[PDB]
């Protein structure tokens, strides 16, 4: 029976009962491409990987029997798609298993910036005591009224559409920018569309990123573009860490051009408050890249990935695959 | 005439309005025993926040008081019936922070399901998470919102605002209110129950939005807290006297309640090192600031000042717009 390896992981309690009568399961709990066992590089047919490991063209050439790679999640920017197609390797993913979980987490961060709640809870644990009304107005200074504000969205995908529907119930005014969509998509949802990125930044009070990390949008929020935003705006990022230049963001927070920022993904992971360009920056909220986790979502995505492997082994590639992302490049 | 601010020091907004019709003064008092003797003899009107309580004995010490205006929506700290007999009118600002309080309630609900305050707190303590297995452990307990049931106690101004916003996330909404008419749920497309016990049996998250009258003190007592489901949430942003904190602490420790978010407490100011909730897991607290906003603060202060001016240059209670003791007034 063939061999299937989990590149970065130790727990295989869900995949084992599915792939037990058709293949052999193994794990390697690796943190880099140099920690992969020699047996895997010679006798592996399929592989499963999370977002914690990156594969390049040189790494792919070291495999001698790999035929399919399945990514547990929705992002595949850490795999060289074009190079794998030339070598004859198919890449798959799970498109939508945590659409609603990520949309709810985005709304939670937006409300924390307007109605300051994490900062107020943090102050009480430090020992701050507030008794009079004047003290209340000072500790919670900066809260604003949501109704009448403008919300800007970059990338109207699965998550982007979910956020737009929930934001209208609070009184927001929604704009979006997407250059790869057809005409009339905004008519169905009753939204407003702009044509340039600069126009979106001029008329927005809160900016959220929901696009993908291709090769034409690296460091989208750079030093030049961060000066085109309004005076005292917010920024929420939950898509990818490579879309924001953290060095330029830190200077904006100190000078006061940006009132606050909530981040879930960073350029360098794992994140620590004592290291990096954001070592000492006021008005910052960070989470350890957990905007997708749920009890139901975790089980659903692991079972779907396991069944994709079984179809490939007992079928034909890529006719039997449902979610293939390098079909054009495959030869 | 003389107008006094019982508990406050800042009068930059009320002064330009009440400058050509009365004399403004402040006391900055924290108790009824810290009021100056001149106020007790030569005061026509008064302004007060929620930080001071007046009883019948306190009211009898005033010799010229005619009107009391409460800056806010709650008036449970003033003896309404006793003031009516003495010939004193009580007013308030009904709706100036309806939407601010509704947004704050939704923020607390999302923090319990999608754990965000606790995850941010862990990072500041120095916790480091690198592998996926570590992520599943630190954030263990998150759930899926769609398909859950939300229970609301008291469908008022704030209660209706919360219900509309909760339907966009996929919640199923029930409510309990014994003082409403028939068919209110038909207009909003909600579901209504008839008893408090029935609401607790079929709810996964309970929010309090009622008023603090004399028939609902310690509504969530020891007996009722055992009728809730296994592993439910609790959000309180109305008043501190509706929840028995001694019984709540035991439920959190044993695990019958997964978490609780509180904005108002029985004893204020609140401190994590004192009280029955000194050591209780899964707790979120805020310093009674679910109403503050830059626009809301200015709006409520101007409205209260103009209510005083109408009373002085008019007749009581014909010229008053928001009077709460009109029936008891003689």
């Amino acid at each position: 029976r063939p061999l299937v390896a989990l590149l970065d992981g130790r727990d295989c309690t869900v995949e084992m009962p599915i792939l037990k009568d058709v293949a052999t399961v193994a794990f390697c709990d690796a943190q880099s491409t140099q920690e992969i066992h020699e047996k895997v590089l010679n006798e592996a047919v399929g592989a499963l990987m999370y977002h914690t490991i990156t594969l390049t063209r040189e790494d792919l050439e070291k495999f001698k029997a790999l035929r399919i790679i399945v990514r547990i999640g929705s992002g595949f920017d850490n795999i060289d798609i074009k190079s794998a197609g030339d070598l004859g390797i198919a890449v798959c993913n799970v498109p939508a298993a945590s659409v609603e979980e990520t949309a709810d987490s985005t709304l939670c961060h937006i409300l924390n910036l307007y109605r300051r709640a994490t900062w107020l809870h943090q102050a009480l644990r430090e020992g701050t005591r507030v008794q009079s009304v004047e003290q209340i107005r000072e500790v919670a200074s900066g809260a604003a009224r949501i109704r009448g504000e403008t919300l800007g969205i970059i990338g109207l995908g699965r998550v982007g559409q979910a956020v737009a529907l929930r934001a209208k119930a609070f009184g927001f005014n929604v704009l979006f920018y997407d250059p790869y969509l057809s005409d009339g998509v905004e008519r169905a949802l009753g939204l407003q569309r702009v044509s340039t990125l600069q126009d979106l930044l001029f008329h927005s009070d809160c900016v959220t990123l929901h696009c993908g990390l291709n090769e034409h949008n690296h460091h989208l929020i750079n030093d030049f573009t961060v000066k085109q935003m309004r005076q005292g705006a917010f920024l929420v990022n939950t898509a990818r860490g490579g879309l924001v230049d953290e060095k330029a963001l830190a200077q904006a927070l100190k000078e006061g051009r940006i009132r606050g920022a909530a981040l879930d993904v960073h350029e360098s992971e794992p994140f620590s408050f004592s290291q990096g360009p954001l070592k000492d920056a006021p008005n910052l909220i960070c989470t350890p890249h957990a905007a997708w986790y749920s009890e139901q979502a975790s089980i659903e995505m692991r079972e779907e990935a396991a069944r994709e492997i079984r179809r490939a082994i007992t079928g034909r590639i890529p006719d039997s695959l449902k979610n293939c992302v390098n079909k054009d490049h495959l030869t | 005439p003389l107008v006094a601010l019982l508990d406050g020091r800042d009068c930059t907004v009320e002064m330009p309005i009440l400058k050509d019709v009365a004399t403004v003064a402040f006391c900055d008092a924290q108790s009824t025993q810290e009021i100056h003797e001149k106020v007790l003899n030569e005061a026509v009107g008064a302004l007060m926040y929620h930080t001071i309580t007046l009883t019948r004995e306190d009211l009898e010490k005033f010799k010229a008081l005619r009107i009391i205006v409460r800056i806010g929506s709650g008036f449970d700290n003033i003896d309404i019936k006793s003031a009516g007999d003495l010939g004193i009118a009580v007013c308030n600002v009904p709706a100036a922070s309806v939407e601010e309080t509704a947004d704050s309630t939704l923020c607390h609900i999302l923090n319990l399901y999608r754990r965000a305050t606790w995850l941010h707190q862990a990072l500041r303590e120095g916790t480091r998470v690198q592998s996926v297995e570590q992520i599943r452990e630190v954030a263990s307990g998150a759930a899926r919102i769609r398909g859950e049931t939300l229970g609301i106690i008291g469908l008022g101004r704030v209660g209706q605002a919360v219900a509309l916003r909760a339907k966009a996330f996929g919640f199923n909404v029930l409510f309990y209110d014994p003082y409403l008419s028939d068919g209110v749920e038909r207009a909003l497309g909600l579901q209504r129950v008839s008893t408090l016990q029935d609401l607790l049996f079929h709810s996964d998250c309970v929010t309090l939005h009622c008023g603090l009258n004399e028939h609902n003190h310690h509504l969530i007592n020891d007996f009722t807290v055992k009728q809730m489901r296994q592993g439910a949430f609790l959000v309180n942003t109305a008043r501190g006297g509706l929840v028995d904190e001694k019984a709540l602490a035991q439920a959190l420790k044993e695990g019958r309640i997964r978490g609780a978010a509180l904005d108002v407490h029985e004893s204020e100011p609140f401190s994590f090192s004192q009280g029955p909730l000194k050591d209780a897991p899964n707790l979120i607290c805020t310093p009674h600031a679910a109403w503050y906003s830059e626009q809301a603060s200015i709006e409520m202060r101007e409205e209260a000042a103009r209510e005083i001016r109408r009373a002085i240059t008019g007749r009581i209670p014909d010229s008053l717009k928001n009077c709460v003791n009109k029936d008891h007034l003689t």
């Binding site: 390896a5 399961v25 794990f27 390697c28 | -």
Partner: peptide
């Protein structure tokens, strides 16, 4: 029964119960 091909058997992950097996 998953085969443990954890060649670089390092300890950068303390993720669960304390192992007190003899």
């Amino acid at each position: 029964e998953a085969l443990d091909l954890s060649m670089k058997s390092v300890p950068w992950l303390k993720a669960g119960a304390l192992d007190l097996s003899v």
